[PDB]
Design a protein around this ligand. Structure first.
Ligand SMILES: CCN1CCN(Cc2ccc(-c3cc4c(N[C@H](C)c5ccccc5)ncnc4[nH]3)cc2)CC1
Length: 302
């Protein structure tokens, strides 16, 4: 096993001004902010995850696990850790994805989202996931709520709160492979099952899977052979790919490298694959001292 030589960067609380809350409640609090690294003459828009004040050693072991995972990943379709702040309670600091998570974004823009975008998202999330697979990570929680939007054309997987290495042994029912609900087996192929669901969230513009059906029923339904319905905008070509991510025999499901390929072919002729009313005509941030703003993606460390 190759040694993990990622750099964990500790950041001074004076290097960054918080600027607004974005998401209170549950777990903790997520902020928009700006980060001015040491003496460098850049300002980097960031999100800051400072778990709900109470410092129970429990949740500390959990956020540092994320930190560990997020600091070890490096790919355009995966959200990177910029560093941590050891304040009183550990802050996670990461590139701001200003448009929020892809669930909310499709929910809120159904009338404006073309086939080109939906298939590109699919291609990009597959690349993300394929990258994790290369680094032997199993995400264990892929869902449209965990994909963030940097621009409507550029999404990245986030939330590594349950990532683990393959082999390692160390709850979202509706996105989980059957072997996982039955036996807590979890493989790159159980991730692919959740890709399946994630894709289905996007083609239904934000629907909740098995809306109604309560979690206890789920593994039964699935054993009976039921899956999610073909969404209205989906050609059978697209829906057949979802279906395959949902095959009982886990090795029977597609590999992420195959998904990249298939959606990518599809994205070359989007209207052949997704049928959306109005498709041909669809089209898709503060202070004055913005002279020195640089996106994290353009801020590299030796
Ligand atoms: C109708 C849409 N509505 C208004 C606009 N947004 C508000 C919003 C904007 C950005 C974010 C956001 C969260 C986030 C984020 N969160 C993850 C969990 C994170 C992980 C480690 C460290 C910090 C954050 N990471 C990076 N960029 C981010 N941006 C969340 C909500 C969505 C809801």
């Amino acid at each position: 096993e190759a040694p993990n030589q990622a750099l964990l960067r500790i950041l001074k609380e004076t290097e960054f001004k918080k600027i607004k809350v974005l998401g209170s409640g549950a777990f903790g609090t997520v902020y928009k902010g700006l980060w001015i690294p040491e003496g460098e003459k850049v300002k980097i828009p960031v999100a800051i995850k400072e778990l709900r004040e109470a410092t129970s050693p429990k949740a500390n072991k959990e956020i540092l696990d994320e930190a560990y995972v997020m600091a070890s990943v490096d790919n355009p379709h995966v959200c990177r850790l910029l560093g941590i702040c050891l304040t009183s309670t550990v802050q996670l600091i990461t590139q701001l994805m200003p448009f929020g998570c892809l669930l909310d974004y499709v929910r809120e823009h159904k009338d404006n989202i073309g086939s080109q975008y939906l298939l590109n998202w699919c291609v990009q999330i597959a690349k993300g996931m394929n990258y994790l697979e290369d680094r032997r990570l199993v995400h264990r929680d892929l869902a449209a709520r965990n994909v963030l939007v940097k621009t409507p054309q550029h999404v990245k997987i986030t939330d590594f709160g349950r990532a683990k290495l393959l082999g390692a042994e160390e709850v979202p029912i509706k996105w989980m492979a059957l072997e996982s609900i039955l036996h807590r087996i979890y493989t790159h192929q159980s991730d692919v099952w959740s890709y399946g669901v994630t894709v289905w969230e996007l083609m239904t513009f934000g629907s909740k899977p098995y809306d109604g059906i309560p979690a206890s029923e789920i593994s039964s339904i699935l054993e009976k052979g039921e899956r999610l319905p073909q969404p209205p905008i989906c050609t059978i070509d697209v829906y057949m790919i979802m279906v395959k991510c949902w095959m009982i025999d886990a090795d029977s499901r597609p590999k992420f490298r195959e998904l990249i390929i298939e959606f990518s072919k599809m994205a070359r002729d989007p209207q052949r694959y997704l049928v959306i009313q109005g498709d041909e005509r669809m089209h898709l941030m503060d202070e004055e001292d913005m002279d020195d703003v640089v996106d994290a993606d353009e801020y590299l460390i030796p």
